[PDB]
Design a protein around this nucleic acid. Structure first.
Ligand code: MG
Ligand code: MG
Ligand code: MG
Ligand code: MG
Ligand code: MG
Ligand code: MG
Ligand code: MG
Ligand code: MG
Ligand code: MG
Ligand code: MG
Ligand code: MG
Ligand code: MG
Ligand code: MG
Ligand code: ZN
Lengths: 45, 107, 86, 122, 23, 116, 97, 96, 136
RNA sequence: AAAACUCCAGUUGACACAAAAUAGACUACGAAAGUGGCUUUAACAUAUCUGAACACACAAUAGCUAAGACCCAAACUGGGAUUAGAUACCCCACUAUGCUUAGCCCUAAACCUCAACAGUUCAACAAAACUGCUCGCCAGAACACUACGAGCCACAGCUUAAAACUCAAA
């Protein structure tokens, strides 16, 4: 299962041919890691 | 010294190897791995080379082989980091333990 | 020195009451333990004396909160005497 | 193993930023890494004035390079990041999604210690 | 315990080192 | 929550260094320590200062700043009355919690048991 | 004849389960000032403050409802070998009947 | 004999209490949560008696805070004023 | 309604003091040593406006490290701030001397209005090693 | 208080080869010494146990040899106080030294003064009393962490370690 999961995960790896398009995709994308916890064990994003 | 293109011990029994692409082969090869996995490969290679059953890991011979690959690792660490007194002690103690196990296996 | 200058350890007055503004600030420093850090770093405390002092403070903390727990546990039996004449 | 590169870059425009990410990823691949993802945490004010390469930086662009590198490329990669003058701060760590989370049953309660002292009268 | 034996050895040691310094 | 005392003392069967080295045996006593006294206050400083800045400004004339001379005087009067009130207050009752003597009575009623 | 274990299983105090948050009825049997000494069954009595609302129908023999936080109220302290017993349970008075 | 008690593991056993982050993944990039566990005025990391975390989680909060402060994600001497708005989870009381 | 936390520089803030925002109020720095108390009033752009200390006000050796001396020094620094045209003050204290409150109250009675208190006392994260412990 | 500094002090901006607030009310790792800023690499002996004071490998701090670093602290030394005197306590300044590298030296109240492994539930103080097995050590005080001999990169050293006189105790 790990080999098959890794196999499908390589298709979106960055190569020399995907480099410019992926850098521009990274530049117009944005990911947020910040999230808060409450007094109860609940996540506020 | 196994070559860097050698496969991991946990991964060298899955049927799909020769058909996966070169980046996956590299990614699960030993170049994309560490010295603990290299020592595991070396130890099982020695086990296949010498002992009768390489699936025991509870015998005097298997314990001597494990101590020998650990002694080689302790050595190599010492000629990089010469001033490592804790690992010098570990190497000397492991040498004495291997000598004790050698004496027991000889007798 | 390299941080923004007017956020850390900053409190504000209400209605001009600089007294409670400072008393709040000194409370901030005391509850964060900064006051005792400055008072202990005025002179160098050698590491043996450091370890002795922190072991002593930890033992005192253990004893003090165990006694406080006992006092709160017996303040309910500090009622008036139920049977006066025995 | 899998590594994560936290990259604080100088506050730039789109072409200079794209060129700098290109040089960093190309250096990774030349030292022998297969790069997995690039993430853009975005341009924001720094927590403090980071002084790097004879310039005092107040804002920076946060990027992440998730990749896999051999065990003997991290030192060369940090040397290259030390020499790059477009990088405010580059750092390589092992991947928190390669360290695995353990199941926790909860907080096991602790009782009061007993028989620390003898039962003599004292 | 007290330190009288430690004090006796202390004075013995001190006089010994002063003797070695002098001679 | 009290800090644990599991392996903090040098004991037989403890495979660690002693974390704590208490000079007295860690057993709750039957007593509460006496209430500490307040320290020196040095009151009336500001009013003394303003009266006496007058004195150096106006060549020491009571007729020149009667007003905060009276300020210094009533500061002295209120400080003495505050002394009397706080003495009677601490003799009467501790703020929030109780007197050490009555707490000693409660702990004599419920003694500690270090033995069998 | 029935056994002591029979008495135990067909006793309500064993049918209780844990003592916490169980509503019980009880009788007032001793009163000093405003400290009402209520029994609820079980080994000990609880003591409650007199509720200032409806504060005159709390008399000797009155039936009251209790939340019954605890049954015994003991704890062990730093040097003790046994617990320090209050000889008293813990309950919160809710009202009448 | 049908009425003598029988041996079993404790019924009415409440499940063990769980810390606030217990089961959650803490990162050095999660400077909203690490800012929750940092003091607003002085930047001090709060203790176990204030945070109320299990030992593992408190250790990871401390390590992640120190990492983020040295990598340039967190101020050292203060909490983020952008994050003096989030749900407070620490048992401390400064004002009065 | 009130916040004891300061206004962040780069956002909207309805709080004002004689038209000025929080960021352009002049700053009075009080270094309160164990033997002296020094008060310096500067602008937001670090233009020196007023400077007074206990030794400046006339206390010579050991009377400097008292409350009354810092009170006098704060009064003098406040008077110089008034003649420089200063009304509102942000106070920043550095040290743990006797005359910390006394310097602040000297400013207040001199006639300045404190809007915010800051404590920039130098606390190393185990940097330089201090003097040896005195055997008094 | 004097001495000292005024090439001084306060705000701001640049800026380390030094030391690692809070977490730390946690009790971890290591054989011991020791180890609490961040990252990465290498990595934490033994699938019975005890066991080398005829060996090997380590071992805080101080110290020695050679070459560097320098904020701060600081033996020594100098100055000021104090004192009958003050070779000290108190204040100021500065050096060896603390740091790095390479090599020595091999000592501590190196003590948790409580040996390793396996197992059980009363002299007095201290940290309750024991069992099996093995190793090491001890046998009145002082002479004595001494003398002589031997070994050692140690040469004012360390390890091992007496006796003659003395006492009726320690
Ligand atoms: Mg003692
Ligand atoms: Mg002079
Ligand atoms: Mg260092
Ligand atoms: Mg052995
Ligand atoms: Mg030995
Ligand atoms: Mg040594
Ligand atoms: Mg110096
Ligand atoms: Mg020097
Ligand atoms: Mg030691
Ligand atoms: Mg010994
Ligand atoms: Mg042994
Ligand atoms: Mg010696
Ligand atoms: Mg000798
Ligand atoms: Zn948890």
């Amino acid at each position: 299962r790990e080999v098959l999961q890794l196999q499908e995960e390589v298709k979106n790896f960055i190569t020399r041919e995907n480099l410019e398009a992926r850098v521009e995709a990274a530049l117009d994308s944005r990911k947020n890691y910040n999230w808060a916890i409450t007094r109860e064990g609940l996540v506020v994003r | 010294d196994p070559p860097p293109s050698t496969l991991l011990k946990d991964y060298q029994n899955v049927p799909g190897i020769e058909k996966v692409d070169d980046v996956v082969k590299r990614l699960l090869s030993l170049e994309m791995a560490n010295k603990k996995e290299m020592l595991k490969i070396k130890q099982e290679q020695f086990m296949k080379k010498i002992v009768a059953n390489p699936e025991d890991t509870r015998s005097l011979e298997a314990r001597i082989i494990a101590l020998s690959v650990k002694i080689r690792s302790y050595e190599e660490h010492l000629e990089k980091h010469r001033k490592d007194k804790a690992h010098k002690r570990y190497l000397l103690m492991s040498i004495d333990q291997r000598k004790k196990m050698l004496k027991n296996l000889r007798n | 020195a390299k941080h923004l200058k007017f956020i850390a350890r900053t409190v504000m007055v209400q209605e001009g009451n600089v007294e409670s503004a400072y008393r709040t600030l000194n409370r901030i420093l005391t509850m964060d333990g900064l006051i005792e850090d400055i008072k202990h770093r005025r002179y160098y405390e050698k590491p043996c004396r450091r370890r002795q002092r922190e072991s002593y403070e930890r033992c005192r903390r253990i004893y003090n909160m165990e006694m406080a727990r006992k006092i709160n546990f017996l303040m309910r039996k500090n009622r008036a005497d139920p049977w006066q004449g025995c | 193993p899998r590594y994560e590169l936290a990259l604080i870059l100088k506050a730039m425009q789109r072409p200079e930023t794209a060129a700098t990410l290109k040089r960093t990823i190309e250096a990774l691949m030349d030292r022998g890494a297969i790069v997995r993802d690039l993430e853009n945490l975005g341009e924001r004010a720094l927590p403090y004035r980071i002084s790097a390469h004879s310039q005092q930086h107040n804002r920076g662009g946060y990027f992440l390079v998730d990749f896999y590198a051999p065990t003997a490329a991290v030192e060369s990669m940090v040397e290259h990041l030390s020499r790059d003058i477009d990088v405010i701060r580059g750092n390589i760590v092992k991947h928190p999604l390669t360290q695995e989370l353990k199941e926790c049953e909860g907080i096991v309660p602790v009782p009061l210690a007993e028989k620390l002292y003898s039962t003599k009268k004292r | 315990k007290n330190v009288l034996k430690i004090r006796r050895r202390k004075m013995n040691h001190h006089k010994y080192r002063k003797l070695v310094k002098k001679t | 929550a009290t800090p644990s005392l599991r392996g903090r003392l040098a004991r037989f069967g403890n495979p660690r260094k002693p974390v704590l080295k208490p000079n007295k045996p860690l057993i709750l006593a039957n007593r509460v320590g006496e209430r500490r006294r307040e320290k020196g206050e040095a009151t009336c400083i500001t009013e003394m200062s303003v009266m006496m800045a007058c004195w150096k400004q106006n060549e020491f004339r009571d007729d020149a700043c009667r007003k905060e001379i009276q300020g210094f005087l009533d500061c002295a009067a209120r400080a003495q009355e505050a002394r009397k009130m706080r003495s009677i207050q601490e003799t009467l009752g501790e703020s929030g919690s109780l007197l050490p003597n009555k707490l000693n009575k409660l702990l004599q009623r419920f003694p500690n048991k270090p033995y069998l | 004849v029935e056994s002591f274990a029979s008495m135990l299983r067909h006793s309500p105090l064993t049918q209780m389960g844990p003592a916490k948050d169980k509503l019980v009825i009880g009788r007032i049997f001793h009163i000093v000032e405003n400290d009402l000494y209520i029994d609820f069954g079980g080994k000990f009595h609880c003591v409650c403050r007199r509720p200032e609302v409806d504060g005159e129908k709390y008399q000797k023999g009155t039936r009251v409802r209790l939340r019954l936080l605890d049954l015994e109220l003991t704890s062990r302290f730093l040097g003790a070998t046994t617990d320090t017993t209050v000889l008293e349970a813990n309950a919160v008075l809710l009202g009448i009947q | 004999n049908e009425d003598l008690p029988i041996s079993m593991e404790n019924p009415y056993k409440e499940p063990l209490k769980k810390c606030i982050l217990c089961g959650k993944h803490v990162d050095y990039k999660n400077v909203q949560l690490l800012s929750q566990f940092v003091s607003p005025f002085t930047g001090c990391i709060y203790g176990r008696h204030i945070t109320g975390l299990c030992g593992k989680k408190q250790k990871e909060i401390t390590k992640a805070i120190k990492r983020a402060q040295i990598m340039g994600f967190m101020p050292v001497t203060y909490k983020d004023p952008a994050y003096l708005k989030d749900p407070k989870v620490c048992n401390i009381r400064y004002r009065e | 309604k009130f916040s004891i936390y300061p206004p962040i520089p780069g956002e909207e803030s309805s709080l004002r003091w004689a038209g000025k925002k929080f960021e352009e109020i002049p700053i009075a720095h009080i270094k309160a040593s164990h033997n002296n108390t020094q008060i310096q009033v500067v602008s937001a752009s670090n233009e020196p406006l007023a400077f007074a200390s206990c030794g400046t006000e006339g206390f010579r050796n050991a009377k400097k490290g008292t409350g009354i001396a810092a009170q006098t020094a704060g009064i003098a620094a406040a008077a110089r701030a008034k003649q420089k045209g200063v009304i509102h003050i942000r106070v920043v204290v550095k040290g743990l001397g006797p005359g910390r409150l006394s310097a602040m109250h000297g400013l207040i009675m001199g006639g300045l209005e404190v809007i915010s208190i800051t404590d920039n006392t130098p606390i190393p994260h185990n940097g330089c090693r201090p003097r040896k412990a005195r055997k008094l």
